[PDB]
């Protein structure tokens, strides 16, 4: 799982 957000993606 990847959220890519705020022109940063984090480990979700």
Do not use: A, N
Not at 1 to 12: A, E, L, N, T, W
């Amino acid at each position: 799982g990847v959220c890519c957000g705020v022109s940063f993606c984090y480990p979700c």
